[PDB]
Amino acid sequence: SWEKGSLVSPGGLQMLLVKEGVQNAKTDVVVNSVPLDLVLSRGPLSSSLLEKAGPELQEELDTVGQGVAVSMGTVLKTSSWNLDCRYVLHVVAPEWRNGSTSSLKIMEDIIRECMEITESLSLKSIAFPAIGTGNLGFPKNIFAELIISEVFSFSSSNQLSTLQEVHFLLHPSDHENIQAFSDEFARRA
Ligand SMILES: CS(=O)(=O)Nc1ccccc1-c1cccc2c1[nH]c1ccccc12
């Protein structure tokens, strides 16, 4: 509990494995996964974020999303309300129907976009919480490698003025993700 796991990429971006649940995020940006209808109470990650943030998070998302055509890969920005961050980036994650290989590529593009948004806002840190393998057809270890590799890729190919830290937020009882990230971090250190 007392430590975060740490891995810095060759390009200088620090990744932290944080085992505190998703409600305690203390980064500038937190990324949420939302449905196409923008209802924040459906999936378990979003429901958890909503429970801490308060219903104002839903109020603001509904307002920013009104009359916006929303599809897979849409990213909408709100303030954080009672979360301990500055902004939430609400993303419509892909599902398996988008195609197997396609869906991994789409997740990579989403990860990259959210980091680019954070840098464009002159912010320092972004958190990606575990969303689960909800409606995606790959095991958690595939997604752990994917996100870490994308952080490596992004930071090697870009000079970053402000973005310094990427936090992976895991619930301490998420045994499968804790094992996947721990193995990846151990392997790369
Ligand atoms: C698929 S997962 O959420 O179980 N894997 C992770 C476990 C812990 C922290 C981050 C991720 C993760 C991996 C790949 C893409 C995303 C992840 N979290 C996100 C949250 C929002 C949007 C994309 C992502």
Distances (CA, A) of 41 to 3, 51, 79, 105, 183: 31, 9, 17, 27, 32
Q: How far is the CA of 91 from the centre of ligand 1 (A)?
A: 11
Fold held by 1-189: Leucine Aminopeptidase, subunit E; domain 1 (3.40.220)
Q: Name the residue at shortest CA distance from atom 7 of ligand 1.
A: 130
- Ligand 1 centroid – CA 81 distance (Å): 22
Cβ neighbours around 3 below 10 Å, total: 9
Ranges of each domain in the chain: 1-189
Q: Is the CB of 148 under 6 A from ligand 1?
A: no
Instruction: Answer yes or no: is the C-beta of 46 below 6 A from any ligand 1 atom.
Output: no
- Per DSSP, the residues of 17-51 read EE-S-STT--SSEEEEE--TT--TTSSHHHHHHHH
Q: What is the resolution of this structure in A?
A: 1.6
* Region of residue 73 (phi > 0: left; psi between -120 and 50: alpha; otherwise: beta): left
Structure tokens, 50: 């909503």
Question: Tokens in use for 96?
Answer: 């398996």
Experimental method: X-ray
Centroid of ligand 1 to alpha carbon of 67 (angstroms): 28
Q: Which residues contact 3 (CB under 8 A, 6 or more apart)?
A: none
Please answer whether residues 166 and 115 qualify as being in contact, where contact means their C-beta atoms are separated by less than 8 angstroms.
yes
Q: Which of 177, 161, 159 is nearest to 169 (CA)?
A: 177
